[PDB]
Paper text:
The infectivity of rotavirus (RV), the leading cause of childhood diarrhea, hinges on the activation of viral particles through the proteolysis of the spike protein by trypsin-like proteases in the host intestinal lumen. The RV virion is an icosahedral triple layered particle in which the segmented viral genome and the polymerase complexes are packaged in a capsid made of the VP2 protein. The external layer is formed by trimers of the VP7 glycoprotein in phase with the underlaying VP6 shell and 60 trimeric VP4 spikes, which project from the VP7 layer, that clamps them and partially covers their base. This outer layer is responsible for the first steps of RV infection: attachment to cell surface receptors, lipid bilayer penetration, and release of the double-layered particle (DLP) into the cytosol, where transcription of the viral genome is initiated.
A single band corresponding to the 98 kDa unprocessed precursor form, VP4, was detected for the NTR-TLP spike protein. The NTR spike displayed the VP4-C lectin domain at the base of the stalk (4A pink), which was absent after proteolytic processing. The density detected at the base of the stalk in the NTR spike allowed the modelling of the lectin domain in the chain C, from the residue T73 to residue N221. While no density was observed for the loop linking K29 (red sphere) of the α domain to the T73 (green sphere), an empty density was present in the region between the lectin domain and the β-barrel of the C subunit (arrowhead). Although the map quality in this region was insufficient for building coordinates, the position and shape of the unassigned density were consistent with the 222–245 loop previously resolved by Shah et al. that directly contacts the 414–420 beta hairpin from the VP4-C stalk. The structure of the NTR spike revealed that α2-β1 and α3-β13 loops that connect the lectin domains to the preceding α domain and the following β-barrel domain embrace the body of the spike and firmly anchor the head on top of the spike. Actually, these loops maintain the NTR spike in a conformation slightly more compact than that of to the TR spike. Furthermore, the external α3-β13 outer loops embrace the opposite β-barrel in the body of the spike, mediating a molecular swap that enhances the stability of this structure. In this conformation, the presence of the α3-β14 loop prevents the displacement of these lectin domains, acting as a “lock” preventing further conformational changes.
Author numbering:
A (entry chain X): 50 to 485
B (entry chain Y): 195 to 485
C (entry chain Y): 50 to 97
């Protein structure tokens, strides 16, 4: 078989949501900003600071033509309203072009579930719209597309334009929670206990006869080189909240030679004791958000999968003991830069841990048909590290290996040693000489 | 005491158990420590394999020939499970919990078989993890969960034994260890999250299935004493019932959560059988002296 | 006999427990409110 190990994988992507903290904001391009209050009134103001200063109000139905005061841009005055609609809630769009000018109220959105989206997109601006379960889109040729700014008091939802469908059904009705895709049961016999009720004369039966079992040892060398594999998974939204920076296993090849004979091999990294950690620079969308940095502390062992296509693995299967003295060396990390459209790019740089062999690990996967193999070495890790570089972070210079870049820029890491051997395989005949 | 204050920007809060660090904050201010090292390292500086000149490779044989038998061992199996869990509280105001834990199973059982009193060990671990969380918001009155492991059917559960009965404790170098097992109901209860105001959320539901899967063999070694392992490769499944969640905005959570399968259930019983074909040297009734 | 198990957790060890937006405190009584200002001025307003 190939390498055998499954350490950890936290895949969390059933969510199609995720708000921000209710504040003011300056939305970038190519999204939608889904508001969601619980009470009629002002929610958010459209601000461009040069040409257009938008406004909007959500109104409770059943209230025919009347007159309601509103605090437009923090300044209050008396305004007229109208609800000929009596079932679904109305959401007017007060289009205004100067704070000192007339209060131009527009918009005819008809939706109870109290959610709408306005955000910059495709060097342009538009809006959603809807009456009953028939949600469409508004068309807003707003001068100064380029400087959209939102000032609100309740929660939003961040959501791009590219998937217009899900959002138009949200504004149609809303968001019931995760609901589906769990019913698959093509596996059941009946009643779970009619077919086995016995103990019935447990283990006793012969399979094969015995033979001679001598030892033929093969004491030669072994060498290994190291590198790690990483995956970077961030969180959605505008692109600042991030989720996953850690290691992953991967099968790696080498063309070695030993005892005057060439050797080919397989290797796959696997590490014990990896500590998740959030280097949270602030949950607010204008700060640094990573759900977890899987970091290394000296509680980390080595389960890195190893293989050899030499004679050794073909020989040793039934091993009672196998020890060595490997090249206990130093391991470092690389450098990686994080993408932030606004601000300064955060970085990961540095990090180093030293290993020391602490055992070996053989493993055999018995299938219903065959018996898959695997083998591992155990190294216990001690830190002597260059103090992680990550800028604009309250936490800095932590100890261990970096969670992003193990490439290290150098050639590789030298791991080498010797071996004894112990086994039992068919050998020559000693029956031919049964006497001294 | 009925005060109601409003902070207009990004500011920090802290409870009782960290009064001292608040005092040093307002005394000096220590956001940065930025050094997770104790002292000048009390460990070896560097000891690698200097002079890897391994000389001419020469082989020496330890012992003489041996005589090993090959027996199939078909034994009925009743190994009993109980998913271990521990509760560790997390800091905050009261809705800020993160720590749900998993510890290996630690239980012992007693059965009868042909007159032998059954002694076996059971330890469990889970991988293929399907973690989750709750984003009740970010305001300090919001529901906060960092990790909430909802084990789905795409997960592999590892169960390890130190089975004390000699029937289990006579098999090493097993040519082929096959087996058959059963299914478990493995239901789940609910907890509550308590910030001292308002009703508390209920992670309701949990009625999951398990079915047959593989079993493997592995061993570790130290200097002269090794470490054997009877490793199991079992995967969890799903069944027909849906698991509602009420008074929550994240509902219909499917699979085993990380909280509680005890629920007053006595144990999680999965009966079955073993069938092991083992290379064994100890059954030689042959080299007996005369008289 | 020797077991094998993998699990880990490391969350907030600096007890960095105040990242929050402009607030509306109706909090549980008896805490310490760390001030994290950019430019000094009005920071918190209280009401009976």
């Amino acid at each position: 078989w190939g390498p055998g190990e499954i350490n950890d994988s936290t895949t969390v992507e059933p969510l199609l949501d995720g708000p921000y903290q209710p504040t003011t904001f300056n939305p970038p391009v190519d999204y939608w900003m889904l508001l969601a209050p619980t009470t009629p009134g002002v929610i958010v103001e459209g601000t461009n600071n040069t040409d257009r200063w938008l406004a909007t109000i959500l109104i409770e139905p059943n209230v025919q033509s009347e007159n309601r005061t509103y605090t437009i841009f923090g300044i209050q005055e008396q305004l007229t309203v109208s609800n000929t609609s009596q079932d679904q809630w109305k959401f007017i769009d007060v289009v205004k072009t100067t704070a000192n000018g007339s209060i131009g109220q527009y918009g005819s959105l008809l939706s109870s579930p109290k959610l709408y989206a306005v955000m910059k997109h495709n060097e342009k601006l538009y809006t959603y719209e809807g009456q009953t379960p028939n949600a469409r889109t508004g068309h807003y040729s707003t001068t100064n597309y380029d400087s959209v700014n939102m000032t609100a008091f309740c929660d939003f939802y961040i959501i791009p334009r590219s998937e217009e469908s899900k959002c138009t059904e949200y504004i149609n009705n809303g968001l019931p929670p995760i609901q589906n895709t769990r019913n698959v049961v093509p596996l059941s016999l009946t009643a779970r206990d009619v077919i086995h009720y016995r103990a019935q004369a447990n283990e006793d039966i012969v399979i094969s006869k015995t033979s001679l079992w001598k030892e033929m040892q093969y004491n030669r060398d072994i060498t290994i080189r190291f590198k790690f594999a990483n995956t970077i998974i961030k969180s959605g939204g505008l692109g600042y909240k991030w989720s996953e920076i850690s290691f992953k296993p991967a099968n790696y090849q080498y063309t070695y030679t030993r005892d005057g004979e060439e050797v080919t091999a397989h290797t796959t990294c696997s590490v014990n004791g990896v500590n998740d950690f959030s280097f949270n620079g602030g949950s607010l969308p204008t700060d640094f958000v990573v759900s977890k940095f899987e970091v290394i502390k000296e509680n980390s062992y080595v389960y890195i999968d190893y293989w050899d296509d030499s004679q050794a693995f073909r020989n040793v299967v039934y091993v009672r003991s196998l020890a060595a003295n490997l090249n206990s060396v130093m391991c470092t990390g690389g450098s990686y830069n994080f993408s932030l459209p606004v601000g300064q790019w955060p970085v990961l740089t540095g990090g180093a841990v030293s290993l020391h062999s602490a055992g070996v690990t053989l493993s055999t996967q018995f299938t219903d048909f065959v018996s898959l193999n695997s083998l591992r070495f155990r190294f216990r890790l001690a830190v002597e590290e260059p103090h992680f570089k990550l800028t604009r972070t309250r936490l800095d210079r932590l100890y261990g290996l970096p969670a992003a870049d193990p490439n290290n820029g150098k050639e590789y890491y030298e791991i080498a040693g010797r071996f004894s051997l112990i086994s039992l395989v068919p050998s020559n005949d000693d029956y031919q000489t049964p006497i001294a």
